[PDB]
Amino acid sequence: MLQCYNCPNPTADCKTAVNCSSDFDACLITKAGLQVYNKCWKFEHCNFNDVTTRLRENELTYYCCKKDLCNFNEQLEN
């Protein structure tokens, strides 16, 4: 399985590791101001439009990856 940081709410430093279900193929980290999101996700939705409409944030940067626990803060210069 792919293990990602996955917090249901934005969290300054998400430490919750979960085994994503096979529905997902990516780990996502997104920074929107001081809000940081960490999710099991899909690469088909790892794009600005799809992340903004799903997380309901106007302005953000994002990174997706497919190695264990790869969706960490330092991946995103922001």
Side-chain angles (χ1 to χ4, degrees), residues 25-74:
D25 61 6
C27 306
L28 170 70
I29 180 173
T30 300
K31 292 176 170 182
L34 294 173
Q35 285 63 56
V36 185
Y37 303 80
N38 300 260
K39 308 284 181 180
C40 298
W41 211 249
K42 298 187 74 175
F43 278 109
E44 68 179 354
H45 302 134
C46 287
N47 59 74
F48 185 91
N49 187 60
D50 290 347
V51 173
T52 57
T53 70
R54 294 171 163 65
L55 303 181
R56 301 181 299 271
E57 288 276 16
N58 288 335
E59 183 179 57
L60 59 82
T61 57
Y62 71 92
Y63 176 79
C64 291
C65 52
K66 53 178 316 156
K67 291 303 165 274
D68 277 4
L69 303 182
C70 63
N71 60 328
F72 56 89
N73 192 288
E74 292 84 0

Side-chain angles (χ1 to χ4, degrees), residues 2 9 41 62 75:
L2 177 62
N9 320 129
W41 211 249
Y62 71 92
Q75 296 284 36

